[PDB]
Structure formats: C-alpha cells, structure tokens
Design a protein around this ligand. Structure first.
Ligand SMILES: Nc1ncnc2c1ncn2[C@@H]1O[C@H](COP(=O)(O)OP(=O)(O)OP(=O)(O)O)[C@@H](O)[C@H]1O
Ligand SMILES: Nc1ncnc2c1ncn2[C@@H]1O[C@H](COP(=O)(O)OP(=O)(O)OP(=O)(O)O)[C@@H](O)[C@H]1O
Ligand SMILES: [Mg+2]
Ligand SMILES: [Mg+2]
Ligand SMILES: [Zn+2]
Ligand SMILES: [Zn+2]
Lengths: 379, 379
C-alpha cells in the first residue's frame, strides 16, 4: 500500500488528481449538481518518473479496489471482457492499463472500444492508462467520451531529488556526516528510479565491511559505480555539457524579450518542464493570423541555435529539432498570407536576424548563464 | 578444494567477488540494513582464463555446498527442478551453471525462468553462470531480477603469467638455474591453461632422462614442443607480429591526445584488457548529442587503421572491425543532426583527418613504440 506521502517532486500532477480522489469517495456529491466526470485519463512521461506509482497512490488515498493489466503481455478480447466485469460488480473502483501503446491485434482494440461505451460513470468507475509514446496512439481512442484528459509527469529538479532521497532512507540508519542536500546537487539528470537504485548500492558498500551505518563516503563511491563499467544504469550531466545547455536556454529568453511580439518569460531551467520541451505534440493556436507576429515567433524559435553558433560554433540535436519546426511554420505561411524557394528564404532571413541580436546583447547573455550555473533554475 | 591462493592475474575480478563471500558467511548482516543482493551473476571471458576455477574458489573461501550442472550435456526440465530443490534444502549454498549459452529446447528455458523467480534471496542463495559467447543469450535472462551483474575475466600480462608459473611449481623440485621471470617474458599470448600444460611437458623431459630436478634447458625445449607439430596446443606472438600491434595501439593514443574533445589516456598495452577490446557489446552513452564531439570520436576510432597504412601499407582484422563501428555511428548521426551517399563522405573525411595527424607527429609515435617493445605496458 502506498499513498501521496511516497511521491516526490510531482506537485502539479498531484494537484490535478485531487479531484479524482474526492469523486471516488462519494459520487453522490457530484451527481446532485450535474457535474460530469471524464471516463478515461492518460498519464504521459519519460520512463522511470513514476506513472505506475501515481496510479497506485490514488487507490490508496481512497480505499477502493484496484484492477490492472499490462499491455506488454499481449484470447486477447476475452481478457478485456473479464477485467471490466470485475470492476462493475464492485461499483466504486479503478481500471488501470499499462503500456497502452502496445495494445492500442485488431480484435483486442475493438473490444476495448465496446467496453468504454458500455459502463455507467455515475456509479463511481474510472479508467486510467500510461505511456511514453503518446504520438503513435490510434486517433479513435482520443475521441470525446473515451480519453479526453491528459496529465504530464516531469523529471525532478534539485529540490525534487532531495525529497526522493529522504523517502527511501527513512528506514535506514545514517551517520551524522551524511548531507542529502550535497548529494542532490551532484546528480542532475537522474530520475526517481535512478535515485532509488543509488541508495541500495551505498548500503551494499557498508554491509560488505560489517558496519551498521551508512557514511558520506559510501554515497560518494556509489555514484561512480552506477554510471560506468560493464554494469551501468544511469546517465548524468557533466560540467562541460552543463555550460552548453545553459547557453541554449538563455538564448531563447533573450530573443523573446527583445522582439515586440514575443511572449513574456516566467522561468528558465536546466531540466525540461513542459510537454513541448519533452518532444510531444499530443494530437493538438491563435484566433488571428498576422505576418508580424508570425515572423517574431520564428525568430525567437531560432534563438537557441544562434547562441550555439556565435559562442561555440557547434550544433546539438535540440537545435536540429528547432530548425525542422520552423520550416513547417513557414510553409503554412506561404499558403495563407500569399514555393520551396520562397520557404527557404523566409527561414534564412529569420536566422540572420537572431544572430545579430545575440551579438548586440552578449554581455547580458553572459550574466544570466553565470547565475544559472550555480542555482540551476530562475523562477 | 581451492581458494583464492590458487588464482593468478585476476585482481580486479577477485575484488568484485569479495562481497559475495561476506554475504554467504552471514546473511543477517545484510538483512538488518535492507541491502538487497542480486539473484544471478554472469562471468564472461575467453576460454582457458579460469571462469570455472573462480566459481569453485568462492565456495572454498566460504564453507558452503556447491551444486553444479553443465550446459553442454543437454528430461531437461526435470533436471533443472532437481538441482534447485537441493540448494533450498541446504539454505546457504551456490548454484552454478556452465555453458549457459548452449541451454539458453524451449521447455528447458521456461523451467529455468520459473526457478529463478521462485526462491528467496534472503536465505543466502545465489546463482552463477559462465560463457564466452554473451551476445547470443536470450534477452529474457537479462531482465531485472534474473541476471543483472556482469564480471569480465581477462588474459594475463607479464606479471600475471609469472604468478601462475609459481602456483604450479610449488610441489615440484627445481634446479638453481631456473628463472621463471625469463620464462614469463617469452610467452606473450598464453593463458592460464596453456601455462599449466607447459609445466607438465618440462617434467616429462626430465623424467625421460632419469633426473630428479627440472633445469632451465627443460623449460626452453618445452616451449618449442607445444607450439608446433602434429600435436600443438598454443599460440604466441612472434617478434614480427609484436611490432605491428604496437603501432596500432600507439596510433589510438596519439590521435586522442591531439583532438580537443578526445578522452584522456591512462594505459597502453600489447594485451587486451576491457570488454570493448575483447569484442563484446554486452547488450548495452552521453546525455547530450553534439556534432563537434561526435566527429572527434570518429577520428580517434580510426587512429589505429591510419598508422598501419602510413607506416606499413597493410590492414589487420582489428582495423576492419573499427571501420564497421564507425559506419554505424555515422548513420545515426545523419538521422539525428539533420542518405548512403551522405554517410560515405562523413567516414572518408574523418579518415583523411587522422592520416595527417599521424604524419605530423611521426617522431612521437616512434618514441612510444620503442618503450612499449621492451616493457609491454605503460601505466
Ligand atoms: N517520484 C518518485 N518518488 C519515489 N520513488 C519514485 C518516484 N518516481 C519513481 N520512483 C521509483 O521508481 C520505481 C519504478 O518506477 P515506476 O514504475 O513507478 O515508473 P514508470 O514511469 O511507470 O516506469 P516505466 O516506464 O519503467 O514503467 C518505483 O519503485 C519507485 O520506487
Ligand atoms: N589464473 C589461473 N591460475 C591458475 N590456473 C589457471 C588460471 N586460469 C586457468 N587455469 C587453469 O586452467 C585450467 C582449466 O581452465 P578453467 O576450466 O578454469 O577455465 P575456463 O575459462 O572455465 O575454461 P573453458 O572455456 O575451457 O571451460 C584449470 O586446470 C586451471 O589449472
Ligand atoms: Mg513500471
Ligand atoms: Mg572448464
Ligand atoms: Zn531550442
Ligand atoms: Zn583499433
């Protein structure tokens, strides 16, 4: 059994799931005012971030049964029928499906669509699913009445990493020299699964010497064992890679602040945070289409690639993704505001414009990077 | 009965196995702090290096029973069931499987997976296996909870060879002119099995003449008998082959030291040492993907092949493996940083770059080779 006290660094996701817990505890409070709940909910995120753990914590905060199946184990149609019948017989309950992209071969998909349409939501039944490849899902699953809510689960930041370390050492004896805050600052790029495996390695080092406490030296030696060798499990960002990433992020922020139609900036960080930063389209944005605001959007989207070329003379894979998105936007501009030769010159002009802004504001760009290299995030 | 005193030239491997010996002597010391041990361990290395001997030495350092089976002898499912039942009845024990690649026909594999999931590790039970073809194993065996630790066993160097000769002559009478250090310098490329057979041949030469001691002349004549003829058993590196190998290894080191993104060099040797140098992938590496560091990695990987062509005008099988790896890296570069014609020119440009570095630093390359030809290793 787990609850929300076993989860670290997922404040925004836990905020959205509070509604589900209340509904499962007393459906009648929603029915008496005509509030209609979605039938399915989708969790999307990178592997190891805790999508399966979040679902189990929902069923713990409300004492309801938990019926689950795994999509990687896929007779198929018969198994889906059995699972939904169990949930109906016990009215307020949960149905959970894992690796839904594996199963969502044509008979199994058809049966699932029949089951979603055939149960009554007012009883207190809800369906949940998880995936890390949302862009290959069948469009029939996402139509209204089937799966119309999405929640994004993100990698942790420095304060999120420190919380997870505390959760997994509360049943272990520690020495007085252990500083979990220093350990958190040395593991950027780790996820919750990586941090849980790191605590086990430090305990093996202490046990192999017969000691009954874990010291600060055990933790530091465990970091080197998990990132190198024939049996390695994790990747972290080195100090050299950190400097290049900081210049890329600060390049976006400076160009947006200078163009008149650019959007305001609220946060800069070394760790990705949104669904766009994670590389998802989610099968998905202005009422009015204008030339001046479309050109300002293109220039700011090439700000990260321009700072790399002016400062280092290099190019990363994130900058190559940015250039591909810009070409798609320009192609739609030509067909709406009044062909390949025309698209090519629009992108080239925007790139030159961004490079001049980077040269003229080089001093401010350097100042931002220095603060980022010590704090990792500016709110 | 054998212990760690019967093993030579395996210091790093013996270091990793100290944890297993402590666990088998008293499991409760691991349980009281929540340290969780792996269920299976894999030993990988070339034939004759002592993988079966290392496993038997673990069961000697800790007085526990030793149950073993051989994979080349494969009713199959029934034999696997019997072996695991014996180990459970005697709680702290060892299960050893040899030639696991032969057995890992579909019924026997399924039974093994059932047994691995059905025993309790906290009792003090552990499973070990060995192979020299790790890349053909079924991926189901390597999933978490089954076989998640790997240890590499390497061929011996000059000081490792001298130790093995001492182990196998401690019960034999030697003359005063025998110098085991000179014998070690004359057998590069031998493994422990070859060295153990060489001592027996020298004893037969002495016994055939009625003598009661083994002289230095007996050892020198035994070398020629085991490497040639209708009954030959061993291969060694000749002085002509030694010179070509030294230039190949020094070519990698010089190119890495000159490119800005190359990695530091800690050791150069005539004998292979790592799992990459032995030709294994092990079913397995940077957080950030960048163009400048990917090109520097390609250039250094072709350094050995470039020194062969500039100095001798030849090509070996190791250089042909290097060219195949480079083509795989370049192919992934084209699809991530922005087809066959494009891949071909990336590899050709990197090869030309390495050849110019070799010509410009020819003097330093010659100096390193001379030291290597006398010491065999530079730490
Ligand atoms: N925020 C977290 N707090 C604590 N533990 C976490 C957290 N995130 C992940 N873990 C650990 O991760 C381990 C496995 O991750 P989990 O299965 O929950 O994630 P996932 O996103 O569903 O992964 P996968 O893609 O592998 O299925 C769990 O044992 C849990 O201990
Ligand atoms: N490091 C060593 N020290 C001493 N003897 C060794 C060493 N390595 C191998 N031997 C000798 O090798 C002989 C056989 O090798 P062993 O079976 O232990 O190796 P292996 O890697 O399991 O071989 P194979 O692939 O043939 O099964 C043993 O009798 C042992 O005498
Ligand atoms: Mg999981
Ligand atoms: Mg053997
Ligand atoms: Zn960018
Ligand atoms: Zn090479």
């Amino acid at each position: 059994r787990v609850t929300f006290k076993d989860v670290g660094g997922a404040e925004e996701a836990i905020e959205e799931l509070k509604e589900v817990v209340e509904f499962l505890k007393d459906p009648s409070k929603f029915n008496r005012i005509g509030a209609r709940m979605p039938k399915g909910i989708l969790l999307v995120g990178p592997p190891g971030t805790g999508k399966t753990l979040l679902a189990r914590a929902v069923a713990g905060e409300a004492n309801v049964p938990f019926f689950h199946i795994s999509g990687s184990d896929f007779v198929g149609a018969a198994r889906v029928r059995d699972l939904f019948a169990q949930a109906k017989a016990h009215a307020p309950s949960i149905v959970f499906i894992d690796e839904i992209d594996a199963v969502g071969r044509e008979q199994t998909l058809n049966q699932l669509l029949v089951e979603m349409d055939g149960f009554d939501s007012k009883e207190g039944i809800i369906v949940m699913a998880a995936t890390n490849r949302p862009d290959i899902l069948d469009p029939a699953l996402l139509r209204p009445g089937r799966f119309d809510k999405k929640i994004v689960v993100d990698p942790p930041d420095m304060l999120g990493r420190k919380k997870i370390l505390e959760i997994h050492t509360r049943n272990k004896p520690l020495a007085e020299d252990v500083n979990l805050e220093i350990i958190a600052k040395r593991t950027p790029g780790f996820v919750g699964a990586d941090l849980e495996n790191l605590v086990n390695e430090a305990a093996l080092l202490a046990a192999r010497e017969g000691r009954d406490k874990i010291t600060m030296k055990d933790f530091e030696e465990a970091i080197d064992r998990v990132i190198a060798g024939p049996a390695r499990k994790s990747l972290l960002i080195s100090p050299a890679e950190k400097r290049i990433i900081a210049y890329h992020e600060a390049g976006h922020a400076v160009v947006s602040t200078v163009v008149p139609n650019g959007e305001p900036v609220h946060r800069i960080s070394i760790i990705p945070r949104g669904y766009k930063a994670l590389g998802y389209t989610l099968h998905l944005d202005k009422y009015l289409v204008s030339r001046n605001e479309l050109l300002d959007k293109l220039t700011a989207l090439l700000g990260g690639r321009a700072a790399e070329e002016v400062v280092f003379g290099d190019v990363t894979s994130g900058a190559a993704n940015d250039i591909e998105r810009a070409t798609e936007i320009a192609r739609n501009m030509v067909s709406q505001l009044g062909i390949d030769e025309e698209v090519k010159k629009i992108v080239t002009n925007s790139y030159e414009r961004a490079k001049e802004i980077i040269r003229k504001y080089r001093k401010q760009l350097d100042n931002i990077v220095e603060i980022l290299l010590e704090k990792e995030t500016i709110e």
